[PDB]
């Protein structure tokens, strides 16, 4: 629940950067009918950027309190039922993937046959 | 007779071409969905 | 401590020359503001990765829960997409059978 | 020999062509058979 929060904070960081770049691009695209439309789009983008900043602050505040163990200690140099349950999902997913393989190779053969037959109908 | 036969041929060709396009679109989506899984 | 504060400080300083009450000065200003903004963003990235590594090595159970969630969700994605292909397949089968 | 053609394009590919008839009795690639009529027409 906390690693997901860290990943969400990271993702929001990339969205913040992307939104800043998009804001600068949109300001560049403005050349003096549709001007009010661009202005409303700019207002929407700025307000959602502010909401994104608020969400990032909330995530940081939540994750800051919850370090006892430092870095560079856990790097390995040269010198219980969860596993049981996980396996079934892996096997089931693998089986599903295998089934998709049969459908895919069949559809591609069908399209190859129709291409070959239709190419020379003239 | 000739005119009727050509009209039927044209209809069949149109149906096949549209079917091929639809199947290609889906075929494209299926590969992308399948080829990006950790299995 | 509270890197986000100076994150938005740099973000607002990037807009400093615009909201005020001939090219070299603005180019220099945007250069320093943008490089500072990118540096702060990368430092926040580094903090998140350090925390994530510490949490993952301390207790993998939460990582397992996230793995379960993603695998279930992608399962439903596959089922829905194959269902869509079947529906359209039946539709075109009947369309071609009407000939 | 009489109704078969046997051929070796690649050292691991054998293709066979065969005419089948029903006044003469006492897994296939449909694309090539379809194309054969169009070649001759």
Residues linked to residue D16 through DSSP beta bridges, in sequence order: D6
Contact B27 A104 (CB under 8 A): yes
| Backbone φ and ψ of D4, nearest 5° | -115, 150
Resolution (A): 3.7
Nearest Cα residue in chain A from D33? A117
Residue A3 forms contact with C (CB below 8 Å): yes
Total length of chain C: 99
- Cβ atoms of A9 and A73 within 8 Å: the answer is no
Q: At what angle do helices C61-97 and A81-119 cross, to 10 degrees?
A: 30
Question: B-chain residues within 8 Å CB-CB of C85?
Answer: 26, 30
Task: Give percent helix, percent strand, percent coil of chain D, each to the nearest 5.
Answer: 25, 20, 55
Of the candidates B32, C90, B30, B15, which has an alpha carbon nearest to the alpha carbon of residue A114? B15
* Residue partners of A82: CB distance under 8 A and separation at least 6: C61, C64
Burial of residue A86, with CB atoms counted within 10 A of its CB: 0-12 exposed, 13-18 middle, 19 or more buried = middle
Q: Are D17 and D4 in contact (CB under 8 A)?
A: yes
| Contact residues of B toward A, CB < 8 A | 13, 16-17, 19-20, 23-24, 26-27, 30-31, 34, 37, 39
Contacts of C95 in chain B (CB under 8 A): 15
**Cα distances (angstroms) measured from residue C13 to each of A12, C8, C16, C18:** 21, 8, 5, 10
Which residue among A6, A16, A53 places its CB closest to the CB of C51? A6
DSSP string over chain B = -HHHHHHHHHHHHHHHHHHHHHHHHHHHHHHHHHTT---
Question: Which residues, in sequence order, are CB contacts of A45 under 8 Å at separation 6+?
Answer: A19, A22, A23, A26
């Amino acid at each position: 629940n906390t690693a997901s929060l860290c990943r969400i904070g990271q993702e929001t960081v990339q969205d913040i950067v992307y939104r800043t770049m998009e804001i600068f691009q949109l300001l560049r695209n403005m050349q003096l009918g549709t001007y009010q439309d661009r202005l409303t789009k700019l207002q929407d983008n700025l307000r959602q950027l502010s909401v994104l900043f608020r969400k990032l602050r909330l995530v940081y505040d939540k994750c800051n309190e919850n370090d006892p163990i430092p870095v560079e200690q856990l790097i390995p140099y040269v010198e219980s039922e969860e596993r049981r349950e996980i396996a079934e999902v892996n096997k089931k997913l693998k089986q599903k993937n295998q089934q998709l393989k049969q459908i895919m190779d069949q559809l591609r053969n069908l399209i190859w046959d129709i291409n070959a037959m239709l190419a020379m109908r003239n | 007779r000739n005119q009727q036969l050509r009209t039927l041929q044209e209809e069949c060709d149109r149906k096949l071409i549209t079917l091929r396009d639809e199947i290609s679109i889906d075929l494209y989506e299926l590969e992308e969905e399948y080829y990006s899984s950790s299995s | 401590s509270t890197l986000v504060d100076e994150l938005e400080s740099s973000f607002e300083a990037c807009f400093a020359s615009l909201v005020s009450q001939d090219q070299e000065e603005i180019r220099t200003g945007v250069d320093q503001c943008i490089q500072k903004f990118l540096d702060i963003a990368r430092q926040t990235e580094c903090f998140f990765l350090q925390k994530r590594l510490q949490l993952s090595v301390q207790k993998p159970e939460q990582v397992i829960k996230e793995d379960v969630s993603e695998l279930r969700n992608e399962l439903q994605r596959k089922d829905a997409l194959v269902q869509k292909h079947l529906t359209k397949l039946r539709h075109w089968q009947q369309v071609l059978e009407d000939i | 020999v009489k109704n078969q053609i046997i051929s070796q394009p690649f050292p691991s590919l054998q293709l066979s062509i065969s005419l089948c008839h029903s006044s003469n009795d006492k897994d296939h690639l449909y694309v090539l058979e379809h194309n054969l009529h169009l070649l001759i027409r």
